[PDB]
């Protein structure tokens, strides 16, 4: 078990390398085919039947998310037959390209693909592995880019933040609260992509870091919202300020660095005179903070820490590269004169 637990973990990133390093439609077929075969035993380890009744819902979704891709691949074999990763030379194929590929980056359609998976998994350790599946198909879209029907890609993005802004008003499961708002940032970096595909990854990098800090701060004891009442006066009061340092940043306020892509997202989006569409998104992003307020009101205000059981013992977790993470996640908004020069 502990030898191959690295080996299974090793081949996941081996999959997404082959997605990035190829000029061939059949290798990128294989690429996130073997990824979908490498995620399954991570879901299992304690062999609980709820984990099995979550992975199989995860399974046959991504099976079709594989198998629909190849149906697009044989069309531009019948249409000019070249296999370089380029324009698809058929709008009937590019339609079949994107809205199959959008399953693995789950949009406003394919609703319960995200929450029903992430809720019900006992492994709340991670399950940060669902950032890799946010990383691999974005590394195809940078190359599909100059042949899209241009209306389908923006329609899924306007709907993306519309449902994600609504989902967590009806929630206590902080996994589902973090399952939602993963639709939110995946609407923005699609909505840039017709206008300068560079600086899309700027939204991608900031989203990785502010989700990496979130579950590592959730790996103290908390899995339920009212369980985040009983740690300030029980586990550690130092965690209570630090969790307020991130939930307010990821809402996007300008003195923190969570606002930083949405600062730059308009400088690109206008100057190409699309005005009514960024205004509808930024006003929707107001609702992205009322998840966090009404959640930060619970942990930072000492809301009745009952159940007398005092932790006089020390803590030994594995906070691996943890304390160096919210130093570019708060105070980096002055520290990006050109993030669009090293990445772009």
């Amino acid at each position: 078990n502990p030898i191959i637990f690295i080996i299974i973990l090793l081949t996941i990133m081996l999959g997404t390398i082959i997605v990035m390093i190829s000029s061939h439609w059949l290798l990128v077929w294989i690429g996130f085919e073997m990824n979908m075969l490498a995620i399954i035993p991570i879901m299992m380890k304690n062999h609980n039947p709820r984990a099995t009744e979550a992975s199989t819902k995860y399974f046959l979704t991504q099976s079709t998310a594989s198998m629909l891709l190849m149906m697009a691949v044989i069309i531009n074999l019948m249409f000019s037959g070249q296999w370089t990763v380029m324009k698809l030379f058929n709008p009937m194929a590019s339609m079949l390209m994107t809205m199959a590929l959008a399953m693995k980056l789950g949009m406003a359609p394919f609703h319960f693909w995200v929450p029903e998976v992430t809720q019900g998994i006992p492994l709340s350790s991670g399950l940060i592995l669902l950032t890799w599946q946010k990383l691999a198909p974005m590394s195809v879209l940078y190359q599909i880019f100059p042949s899209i029907n241009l209306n389908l890609i923006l329609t899924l993005s306007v709907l993306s933040i519309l449902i994600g802004g609504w989902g967590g008003l009806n929630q206590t499961q902080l996994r589902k609260i973090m399952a939602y708002s993963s639709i939110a940032h995946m609407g923005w970096m699609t909505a840039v992509l017709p206008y300068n595909p560079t600086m899309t990854l700027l939204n991608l990098i900031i989203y990785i870091i502010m989700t990496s800090t979130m579950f590592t701060m959730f790996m103290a004891n908390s899995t339920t919202t009212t369980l985040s009442l009983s740690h300030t006066w029980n586990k550690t009061p130092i965690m209570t300020v630090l969790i307020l340092a991130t939930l307010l940043s990821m809402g996007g306020l300008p003195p923190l660095s969570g606002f930083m892509p949405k600062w730059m997202i308009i400088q690109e989006m206008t100057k190409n005179n699309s005005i009514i569409l960024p205004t509808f998104m930024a006003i929707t992003a107001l609702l992205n903070l009322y998840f966090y307020m009404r959640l930060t009101y619970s942990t930072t205000l000492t809301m009745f820490p009952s159940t007398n059981n005092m932790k006089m013992k020390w803590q030994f977790p594995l906070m691996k590269k943890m304390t160096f993470l919210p130093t570019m996640v708060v105070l980096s908004t002055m520290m990006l004169p050109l993030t669009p020069m090293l990445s772009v």
């Binding site: 070249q82 380029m86 100059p146």
Partner: protein, 71 residues
């Protein structure tokens, strides 16, 4: 009489600083009116390498007399 020359100056520093930092502007607000001239309106020419997209590499073609004369 002994307040100015003990502390600060008049029209020898706060003038010609206005003439100084308003020459950092005409090379800033005018080069920002060249990006819109060039990036948004490049457009169908694609001369300057900003809209340069890869097509194919002709190095990997072959030229041998392959064994069918009419191909």
């Amino acid at each position: 009489r002994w307040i100015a020359r003990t502390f600060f100056d008049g029209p020898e520093k706060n003038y010609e600083r206005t003439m100084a930092i308003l020459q950092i502007e005409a090379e800033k607000a005018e080069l920002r009116l060249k990006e819109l001239e060039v990036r948004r309106l490049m457009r169908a020419r694609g001369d300057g390498p900003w809209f340069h997209y890869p097509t194919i590499d002709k190095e990997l073609i072959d030229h041998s007399p392959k064994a069918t004369p009419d191909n």
